[PDB]
């Protein structure tokens, strides 16, 4: 009552795009337990890597790594379908227990992190400073990743739809679409937000027939 | 230099789940212009409603509505494929210009909001208070929506995959899957996070064959 034991920095994991996703927010009082369900980034992905982070930055690499572990045995499935439940649990002793559980198999892997692990009071100070000092740059990184991720969904989806469409798709249309997917894929390999959005726009402008087919196909 | 004109509250729009998505953060200095690309929530959706909000709450209904407008003319497409670019732009005069543009057609609709619109200094005060007073409840709503949205993706995806699979899927498997989809769909109609996660888990446990087929189908 005169004091309360809180998390000095945010705790989370690295997600697609190299962005930190927070499971336990800064200044949360312990004990505390939070969970979130994630999925795979690639089709037929057999394992996921859980990279535990401490910090306030948006870029995962800009935060303090507390450790990493893998959860394997994920059964073949389209990407984004597997259910990997990640749980962060800080007990009365300030020990952090991170678990990843495949909801299909029930398979689970854990990493335990001592209360003394992480950044010390000075590092914590520098961290809170760096974050405020770079709120803008992080916002930019934040939007780029959102763009990359949207373009990646578009690329992946469109390819599946072209396959499902087959003969239904006119030769002219398929030719424009496949040229646009190549450009989009090359763009995603970069760091230029505008270029990625340009390629997505192109794809959107030439995929109108494919969109109708795909829509009708499941309607 | 002695003063700077900033946004007292966050500005954004309502997204699927009835959650507020922020385009311009609290205390941003103007002029300022930010954009984000959204998509449709339903297959063959022909229009989207842009509901402009001012506030710090996670629940859209808990924030101040600044107005709404529709962007129609969206061409038939699977849900989540259309590219609707939403731009919030606050000029030197403090006037907010919100635009929604379909990247396929280039069609665009806008709503202009006077610098005097929104919550007054007292309301702003009450708002910042309410948010801190309800940070926990909002975190809960935040996770429920994330769950609802994940279950909705699972329901939608699985149904498409069952269709694409057809004969490839064993009678026993299809029967378990279709019973699980019905349960999941009923669960999404509720407010119980645990129930939705239970149904998603069930689906994950009985969809392992479908997952292999769907994966092989596009591999």
């Amino acid at each position: 009552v005169l004091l309360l034991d809180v998390t000095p920095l945010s705790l989370g994991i690295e997600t697609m795009g190299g962005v930190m996703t927070t499971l336990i927010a800064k200044n949360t009082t312990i004990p505390t337990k939070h969970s979130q369900v994630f999925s795979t980034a690639e089709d037929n992905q057999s394992a996921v890597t859980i990279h535990v982070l401490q910090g306030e930055r948006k870029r995962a690499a800009d935060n303090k790594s507390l450790g990493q572990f893998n959860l394997d045995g994920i059964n073949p499935a389209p990407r984004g379908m597997p259910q990997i439940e990640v749980t962060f649990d800080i007990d009365a002793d300030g020990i952090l227990h991170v678990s990843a559980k495949d909801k299909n198999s029930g398979k689970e892997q854990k990493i335990t992190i001592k209360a003394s692990s992480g950044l010390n009071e000075d590092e914590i100070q520098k961290m809170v400073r760096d974050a405020e000092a770079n709120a803008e740059a992080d916002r930019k990184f934040d939007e780029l990743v959102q763009t990359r991720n949207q373009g990646d969904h578009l690329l992946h989806s469109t390819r599946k739809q072209v396959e499902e469409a087959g003969d239904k798709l006119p030769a002219d249309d398929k030719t424009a679409i496949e040229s646009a997917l190549t450009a989009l894929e090359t763009a995603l390999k970069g760091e230029d937000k505008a270029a990625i959005e340009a390629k997505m726009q192109e794809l959107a402008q030439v995929s109108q027939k494919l969109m109708e087919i795909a829509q009708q196909q499941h309607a | 230099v002695l003063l700077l004109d900033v946004t007292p509250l966050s500005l954004g729009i309502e997204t699927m789940g009835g959650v507020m998505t922020t385009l311009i953060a609290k205390n941003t200095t103007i002029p300022t212009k930010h954009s984000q690309v959204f998509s449709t929530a339903e297959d063959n959706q022909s229009a989207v409603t842009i509901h402009v909000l001012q506030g710090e709450r996670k629940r859209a209904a808990d924030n101040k509505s600044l107005g709404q407008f529709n962007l129609d003319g969206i061409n038939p497409a699977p849900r989540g494929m259309p590219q609707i670019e939403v731009t919030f732009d606050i000029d030197a005069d403090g006037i907010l210009h919100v635009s929604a543009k379909d990247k396929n057609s280039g069609k665009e609709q806008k709503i202009t909001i006077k610098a005097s619109s929104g919550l007054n200094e007292d309301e702003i005060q009450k708002m910042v208070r309410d948010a801190e007073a309800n940070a926990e409840a909002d975190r809960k709503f935040d996770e429920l929506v994330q769950t609802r949205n994940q279950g909705d993706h699972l329901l939608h995806s699985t149904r498409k995959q069952v269709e694409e699979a057809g004969d490839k899927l064993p009678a026993d498997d299809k029967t378990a899957i279709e019973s699980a989809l019905t349960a999941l769909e009923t669960a999404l109609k509720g407010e119980d996070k645990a129930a939705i996660e239970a149904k998603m888990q069930e689906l994950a446990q009985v969809s392992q064959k479908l997952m292999e087929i769907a994966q092989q189908q596009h591999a």
């Binding site: 690295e14 997600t15 697609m16 994630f38 795979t40 690639e42 996921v48 890597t49 990279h51 | -």
Partner: peptide, 7 residues
Amino acid sequence: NRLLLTG
């Protein structure tokens, strides 16, 4: 829906 990679 947030995704993870294989490391």
